């Protein structure tokens, strides 16, 4: 790349061979979990300016170029965000160049030539959706530009929009890239952004997929928002196969069980959003099995215990694998009475090919034999949580199955639901 903006040591740096200078304002926040996760507020002092080396300033009718980054965009909460396009990444000087801008439910790429001809490619996402892949979740952006053909915008490696640009003439962009919310009327607006890159070519579909995969951190489990999953952090649970239900407990102890039951609440602000509630049901807390590692990030193949919170008390997710049948119904046990019940969970973030997939939880007995992935099964018209090796086998012979994929949802200020 010709620009690779990364946090190292105690500063943002360009890791490219150009080592372009970076000026940060006083109100830029870096997430302590991973300081590559940059937070920009709607404040004049919340800005990053890259001073491009002269050699890489864009001034051409013919040179191809691309950009990639990940972004997490908080839910739009009120009418003040309608019909308010605001720049976030600015490389326009003297009315020519490129920029990334946001609006209500949009990510916009703009090219402007030196006669002020414009082309825009746009990603549109709805806030009128039960459970969104995009609202307040880290998503991978890629924009490519071939001066003889098309601009293209990709989301998570998938082509979303393309437009011809061969009618544009000379584009003379800024020698500065300004990361800053410019013209945003929502005082509480922020963005989170990571892994910004600029490339002096049109990336192809394979390069885009490979960049998406390589930047996915796939040896690390992720929460619903795309942040690293953590130990000792309460999470509300979502089963991806039956997303309108939430987890509940039918009594503590081995003679009770955990189950999925309908129906998520409705969150609404008239004409702004209409979503399923996410802060529902029995919270789970992931506990370390292994001694000796201070780190609170949950990694692929980590062994864990799962604690369940019921009326502000913790219990242990567990089962007696001796019960009849392949599907082992899970219970919330008193921790002092866990005895030799099966409770160790292997956490999984990636497939046999090292590609990220949704969180799976493989229950093992105390000898480390698989009891199976945690999902659910219907007994007596109730969707009880289970561990079942049937899931493991289906994955092993198909590489795909349904019911044993989960999301962990912590409270996040980009979502705004009241718990
Ligand atoms: Cl504990």
PDB file of N, CA, C and O in Angstrom, residues 132-178:
ATOM      1  N   UNK A 132     -29.785  -5.960  12.324  1.00  0.00           N
ATOM      2  CA  UNK A 132     -28.945  -5.411  11.238  1.00  0.00           C
ATOM      3  C   UNK A 132     -27.540  -5.998  11.290  1.00  0.00           C
ATOM      4  O   UNK A 132     -26.907  -6.047  12.371  1.00  0.00           O
ATOM      5  N   UNK A 133     -27.015  -6.321  10.123  1.00  0.00           N
ATOM      6  CA  UNK A 133     -25.600  -6.680   9.935  1.00  0.00           C
ATOM      7  C   UNK A 133     -24.713  -5.438  10.038  1.00  0.00           C
ATOM      8  O   UNK A 133     -23.476  -5.610  10.107  1.00  0.00           O
ATOM      9  N   UNK A 134     -25.288  -4.244   9.927  1.00  0.00           N
ATOM     10  CA  UNK A 134     -24.497  -3.019   9.635  1.00  0.00           C
ATOM     11  C   UNK A 134     -24.592  -1.952  10.711  1.00  0.00           C
ATOM     12  O   UNK A 134     -23.597  -1.289  10.945  1.00  0.00           O
ATOM     13  N   UNK A 135     -25.705  -1.787  11.365  1.00  0.00           N
ATOM     14  CA  UNK A 135     -25.881  -0.683  12.335  1.00  0.00           C
ATOM     15  C   UNK A 135     -24.960  -0.899  13.534  1.00  0.00           C
ATOM     16  O   UNK A 135     -25.132  -1.886  14.262  1.00  0.00           O
ATOM     17  N   UNK A 136     -24.028   0.044  13.747  1.00  0.00           N
ATOM     18  CA  UNK A 136     -23.162   0.043  14.943  1.00  0.00           C
ATOM     19  C   UNK A 136     -22.314  -1.227  14.998  1.00  0.00           C
ATOM     20  O   UNK A 136     -21.884  -1.602  16.086  1.00  0.00           O
ATOM     21  N   UNK A 137     -22.004  -1.819  13.851  1.00  0.00           N
ATOM     22  CA  UNK A 137     -21.147  -3.015  13.785  1.00  0.00           C
ATOM     23  C   UNK A 137     -19.952  -2.721  12.895  1.00  0.00           C
ATOM     24  O   UNK A 137     -20.094  -2.078  11.882  1.00  0.00           O
ATOM     25  N   UNK A 138     -18.801  -3.239  13.275  1.00  0.00           N
ATOM     26  CA  UNK A 138     -17.618  -3.069  12.415  1.00  0.00           C
ATOM     27  C   UNK A 138     -17.881  -3.729  11.071  1.00  0.00           C
ATOM     28  O   UNK A 138     -18.041  -4.974  10.999  1.00  0.00           O
ATOM     29  N   UNK A 139     -17.777  -2.933  10.012  1.00  0.00           N
ATOM     30  CA  UNK A 139     -17.900  -3.459   8.636  1.00  0.00           C
ATOM     31  C   UNK A 139     -16.722  -3.016   7.796  1.00  0.00           C
ATOM     32  O   UNK A 139     -16.112  -1.940   8.068  1.00  0.00           O
ATOM     33  N   UNK A 140     -16.329  -3.855   6.863  1.00  0.00           N
ATOM     34  CA  UNK A 140     -15.130  -3.656   6.038  1.00  0.00           C
ATOM     35  C   UNK A 140     -15.528  -2.923   4.760  1.00  0.00           C
ATOM     36  O   UNK A 140     -16.377  -3.442   3.997  1.00  0.00           O
ATOM     37  N   UNK A 141     -14.987  -1.771   4.498  1.00  0.00           N
ATOM     38  CA  UNK A 141     -15.253  -0.948   3.315  1.00  0.00           C
ATOM     39  C   UNK A 141     -14.107  -1.132   2.359  1.00  0.00           C
ATOM     40  O   UNK A 141     -12.938  -1.005   2.770  1.00  0.00           O
ATOM     41  N   UNK A 142     -14.393  -1.283   1.086  1.00  0.00           N
ATOM     42  CA  UNK A 142     -13.353  -1.207   0.056  1.00  0.00           C
ATOM     43  C   UNK A 142     -13.907  -0.408  -1.096  1.00  0.00           C
ATOM     44  O   UNK A 142     -15.008  -0.744  -1.571  1.00  0.00           O
ATOM     45  N   UNK A 143     -13.166   0.559  -1.594  1.00  0.00           N
ATOM     46  CA  UNK A 143     -13.578   1.377  -2.750  1.00  0.00           C
ATOM     47  C   UNK A 143     -12.459   1.295  -3.753  1.00  0.00           C
ATOM     48  O   UNK A 143     -11.286   1.569  -3.399  1.00  0.00           O
ATOM     49  N   UNK A 144     -12.793   0.918  -4.986  1.00  0.00           N
ATOM     50  CA  UNK A 144     -11.794   0.834  -6.074  1.00  0.00           C
ATOM     51  C   UNK A 144     -12.171   1.801  -7.168  1.00  0.00           C
ATOM     52  O   UNK A 144     -13.379   2.019  -7.395  1.00  0.00           O
ATOM     53  N   UNK A 145     -11.178   2.259  -7.907  1.00  0.00           N
ATOM     54  CA  UNK A 145     -11.395   3.244  -8.959  1.00  0.00           C
ATOM     55  C   UNK A 145     -10.489   2.946 -10.122  1.00  0.00           C
ATOM     56  O   UNK A 145      -9.263   2.868  -9.955  1.00  0.00           O
ATOM     57  N   UNK A 146     -11.113   2.622 -11.262  1.00  0.00           N
ATOM     58  CA  UNK A 146     -10.385   2.443 -12.513  1.00  0.00           C
ATOM     59  C   UNK A 146     -10.794   3.570 -13.450  1.00  0.00           C
ATOM     60  O   UNK A 146     -11.977   3.694 -13.774  1.00  0.00           O
ATOM     61  N   UNK A 147      -9.851   4.446 -13.790  1.00  0.00           N
ATOM     62  CA  UNK A 147     -10.226   5.654 -14.516  1.00  0.00           C
ATOM     63  C   UNK A 147     -10.814   5.370 -15.888  1.00  0.00           C
ATOM     64  O   UNK A 147     -11.418   6.298 -16.458  1.00  0.00           O
ATOM     65  N   UNK A 148     -10.582   4.172 -16.423  1.00  0.00           N
ATOM     66  CA  UNK A 148     -11.130   3.813 -17.750  1.00  0.00           C
ATOM     67  C   UNK A 148     -12.482   3.106 -17.631  1.00  0.00           C
ATOM     68  O   UNK A 148     -13.064   2.820 -18.686  1.00  0.00           O
ATOM     69  N   UNK A 149     -12.908   2.745 -16.428  1.00  0.00           N
ATOM     70  CA  UNK A 149     -14.105   1.904 -16.251  1.00  0.00           C
ATOM     71  C   UNK A 149     -14.970   2.485 -15.133  1.00  0.00           C
ATOM     72  O   UNK A 149     -15.710   3.475 -15.388  1.00  0.00           O
ATOM     73  N   UNK A 150     -14.854   1.922 -13.945  1.00  0.00           N
ATOM     74  CA  UNK A 150     -15.862   2.119 -12.874  1.00  0.00           C
ATOM     75  C   UNK A 150     -15.198   2.403 -11.538  1.00  0.00           C
ATOM     76  O   UNK A 150     -14.044   1.978 -11.299  1.00  0.00           O
ATOM     77  N   UNK A 151     -15.914   3.161 -10.714  1.00  0.00           N
ATOM     78  CA  UNK A 151     -15.771   3.149  -9.247  1.00  0.00           C
ATOM     79  C   UNK A 151     -16.625   1.992  -8.732  1.00  0.00           C
ATOM     80  O   UNK A 151     -17.677   1.711  -9.320  1.00  0.00           O
ATOM     81  N   UNK A 152     -16.202   1.353  -7.669  1.00  0.00           N
ATOM     82  CA  UNK A 152     -16.916   0.231  -7.029  1.00  0.00           C
ATOM     83  C   UNK A 152     -16.763   0.318  -5.517  1.00  0.00           C
ATOM     84  O   UNK A 152     -15.638   0.640  -5.053  1.00  0.00           O
ATOM     85  N   UNK A 153     -17.861   0.089  -4.803  1.00  0.00           N
ATOM     86  CA  UNK A 153     -17.859   0.017  -3.332  1.00  0.00           C
ATOM     87  C   UNK A 153     -18.252  -1.385  -2.917  1.00  0.00           C
ATOM     88  O   UNK A 153     -19.256  -1.926  -3.454  1.00  0.00           O
ATOM     89  N   UNK A 154     -17.442  -1.983  -2.067  1.00  0.00           N
ATOM     90  CA  UNK A 154     -17.629  -3.303  -1.454  1.00  0.00           C
ATOM     91  C   UNK A 154     -17.897  -3.162   0.026  1.00  0.00           C
ATOM     92  O   UNK A 154     -17.259  -2.300   0.687  1.00  0.00           O
ATOM     93  N   UNK A 155     -18.725  -4.033   0.579  1.00  0.00           N
ATOM     94  CA  UNK A 155     -18.965  -4.108   2.045  1.00  0.00           C
ATOM     95  C   UNK A 155     -18.677  -5.543   2.438  1.00  0.00           C
ATOM     96  O   UNK A 155     -19.316  -6.463   1.851  1.00  0.00           O
ATOM     97  N   UNK A 156     -17.766  -5.771   3.369  1.00  0.00           N
ATOM     98  CA  UNK A 156     -17.419  -7.151   3.780  1.00  0.00           C
ATOM     99  C   UNK A 156     -17.057  -8.001   2.551  1.00  0.00           C
ATOM    100  O   UNK A 156     -17.388  -9.202   2.517  1.00  0.00           O
ATOM    101  N   UNK A 157     -16.315  -7.424   1.610  1.00  0.00           N
ATOM    102  CA  UNK A 157     -15.795  -8.144   0.441  1.00  0.00           C
ATOM    103  C   UNK A 157     -16.806  -8.342  -0.662  1.00  0.00           C
ATOM    104  O   UNK A 157     -16.433  -8.969  -1.646  1.00  0.00           O
ATOM    105  N   UNK A 158     -18.035  -7.859  -0.493  1.00  0.00           N
ATOM    106  CA  UNK A 158     -19.138  -8.078  -1.450  1.00  0.00           C
ATOM    107  C   UNK A 158     -19.400  -6.791  -2.222  1.00  0.00           C
ATOM    108  O   UNK A 158     -19.585  -5.731  -1.604  1.00  0.00           O
ATOM    109  N   UNK A 159     -19.436  -6.877  -3.543  1.00  0.00           N
ATOM    110  CA  UNK A 159     -19.761  -5.702  -4.363  1.00  0.00           C
ATOM    111  C   UNK A 159     -21.162  -5.205  -4.050  1.00  0.00           C
ATOM    112  O   UNK A 159     -22.105  -5.968  -4.178  1.00  0.00           O
ATOM    113  N   UNK A 160     -21.311  -3.924  -3.748  1.00  0.00           N
ATOM    114  CA  UNK A 160     -22.616  -3.297  -3.411  1.00  0.00           C
ATOM    115  C   UNK A 160     -23.059  -2.369  -4.534  1.00  0.00           C
ATOM    116  O   UNK A 160     -24.231  -2.387  -4.833  1.00  0.00           O
ATOM    117  N   UNK A 161     -22.171  -1.534  -5.074  1.00  0.00           N
ATOM    118  CA  UNK A 161     -22.547  -0.494  -6.062  1.00  0.00           C
ATOM    119  C   UNK A 161     -21.333  -0.261  -6.960  1.00  0.00           C
ATOM    120  O   UNK A 161     -20.196  -0.342  -6.479  1.00  0.00           O
ATOM    121  N   UNK A 162     -21.609   0.093  -8.195  1.00  0.00           N
ATOM    122  CA  UNK A 162     -20.597   0.460  -9.195  1.00  0.00           C
ATOM    123  C   UNK A 162     -21.186   1.492 -10.139  1.00  0.00           C
ATOM    124  O   UNK A 162     -22.410   1.456 -10.445  1.00  0.00           O
ATOM    125  N   UNK A 163     -20.359   2.406 -10.580  1.00  0.00           N
ATOM    126  CA  UNK A 163     -20.780   3.463 -11.511  1.00  0.00           C
ATOM    127  C   UNK A 163     -19.644   3.776 -12.456  1.00  0.00           C
ATOM    128  O   UNK A 163     -18.498   3.783 -12.043  1.00  0.00           O
ATOM    129  N   UNK A 164     -19.948   4.020 -13.740  1.00  0.00           N
ATOM    130  CA  UNK A 164     -18.916   4.423 -14.687  1.00  0.00           C
ATOM    131  C   UNK A 164     -18.321   5.753 -14.241  1.00  0.00           C
ATOM    132  O   UNK A 164     -19.063   6.652 -13.777  1.00  0.00           O
ATOM    133  N   UNK A 165     -17.017   5.868 -14.434  1.00  0.00           N
ATOM    134  CA  UNK A 165     -16.314   7.146 -14.130  1.00  0.00           C
ATOM    135  C   UNK A 165     -15.470   7.591 -15.330  1.00  0.00           C
ATOM    136  O   UNK A 165     -14.738   8.599 -15.180  1.00  0.00           O
ATOM    137  N   UNK A 166     -15.558   6.921 -16.487  1.00  0.00           N
ATOM    138  CA  UNK A 166     -14.647   7.228 -17.625  1.00  0.00           C
ATOM    139  C   UNK A 166     -14.909   8.641 -18.168  1.00  0.00           C
ATOM    140  O   UNK A 166     -14.008   9.161 -18.837  1.00  0.00           O
ATOM    141  N   UNK A 167     -16.024   9.296 -17.827  1.00  0.00           N
ATOM    142  CA  UNK A 167     -16.330  10.678 -18.264  1.00  0.00           C
ATOM    143  C   UNK A 167     -15.608  11.722 -17.400  1.00  0.00           C
ATOM    144  O   UNK A 167     -15.559  12.869 -17.836  1.00  0.00           O
ATOM    145  N   UNK A 168     -15.082  11.351 -16.230  1.00  0.00           N
ATOM    146  CA  UNK A 168     -14.338  12.287 -15.359  1.00  0.00           C
ATOM    147  C   UNK A 168     -12.978  12.568 -15.976  1.00  0.00           C
ATOM    148  O   UNK A 168     -12.370  11.704 -16.561  1.00  0.00           O
ATOM    149  N   UNK A 169     -12.555  13.819 -15.850  1.00  0.00           N
ATOM    150  CA  UNK A 169     -11.252  14.264 -16.337  1.00  0.00           C
ATOM    151  C   UNK A 169     -10.230  14.264 -15.224  1.00  0.00           C
ATOM    152  O   UNK A 169     -10.252  13.381 -14.337  1.00  0.00           O
ATOM    153  N   UNK A 170      -9.346  15.243 -15.256  1.00  0.00           N
ATOM    154  CA  UNK A 170      -8.247  15.284 -14.277  1.00  0.00           C
ATOM    155  C   UNK A 170      -8.813  15.428 -12.866  1.00  0.00           C
ATOM    156  O   UNK A 170      -9.606  16.309 -12.651  1.00  0.00           O
ATOM    157  N   UNK A 171      -8.385  14.560 -11.962  1.00  0.00           N
ATOM    158  CA  UNK A 171      -8.698  14.635 -10.519  1.00  0.00           C
ATOM    159  C   UNK A 171      -7.393  14.993  -9.819  1.00  0.00           C
ATOM    160  O   UNK A 171      -6.402  14.258  -9.955  1.00  0.00           O
ATOM    161  N   UNK A 172      -7.424  16.121  -9.145  1.00  0.00           N
ATOM    162  CA  UNK A 172      -6.244  16.626  -8.424  1.00  0.00           C
ATOM    163  C   UNK A 172      -6.648  16.675  -6.951  1.00  0.00           C
ATOM    164  O   UNK A 172      -7.355  17.612  -6.545  1.00  0.00           O
ATOM    165  N   UNK A 173      -6.313  15.641  -6.200  1.00  0.00           N
ATOM    166  CA  UNK A 173      -6.776  15.529  -4.809  1.00  0.00           C
ATOM    167  C   UNK A 173      -5.867  16.346  -3.909  1.00  0.00           C
ATOM    168  O   UNK A 173      -4.867  16.879  -4.370  1.00  0.00           O
ATOM    169  N   UNK A 174      -6.249  16.422  -2.650  1.00  0.00           N
ATOM    170  CA  UNK A 174      -5.474  17.141  -1.633  1.00  0.00           C
ATOM    171  C   UNK A 174      -4.175  16.385  -1.327  1.00  0.00           C
ATOM    172  O   UNK A 174      -4.097  15.154  -1.461  1.00  0.00           O
ATOM    173  N   UNK A 175      -3.168  17.121  -0.861  1.00  0.00           N
ATOM    174  CA  UNK A 175      -1.987  16.448  -0.305  1.00  0.00           C
ATOM    175  C   UNK A 175      -2.245  16.104   1.163  1.00  0.00           C
ATOM    176  O   UNK A 175      -1.345  15.532   1.787  1.00  0.00           O
ATOM    177  N   UNK A 176      -3.433  16.397   1.686  1.00  0.00           N
ATOM    178  CA  UNK A 176      -3.792  16.054   3.079  1.00  0.00           C
ATOM    179  C   UNK A 176      -5.021  15.153   3.030  1.00  0.00           C
ATOM    180  O   UNK A 176      -5.940  15.410   2.206  1.00  0.00           O
ATOM    181  N   UNK A 177      -5.060  14.180   3.920  1.00  0.00           N
ATOM    182  CA  UNK A 177      -6.308  13.407   4.200  1.00  0.00           C
ATOM    183  C   UNK A 177      -6.744  13.774   5.610  1.00  0.00           C
ATOM    184  O   UNK A 177      -6.007  13.508   6.528  1.00  0.00           O
ATOM    185  N   UNK A 178      -7.936  14.343   5.722  1.00  0.00           N
ATOM    186  CA  UNK A 178      -8.528  14.773   6.999  1.00  0.00           C
ATOM    187  C   UNK A 178      -9.618  13.784   7.417  1.00  0.00           C
ATOM    188  O   UNK A 178     -10.661  13.727   6.746  1.00  0.00           O
TER     189      UNK A 178
END
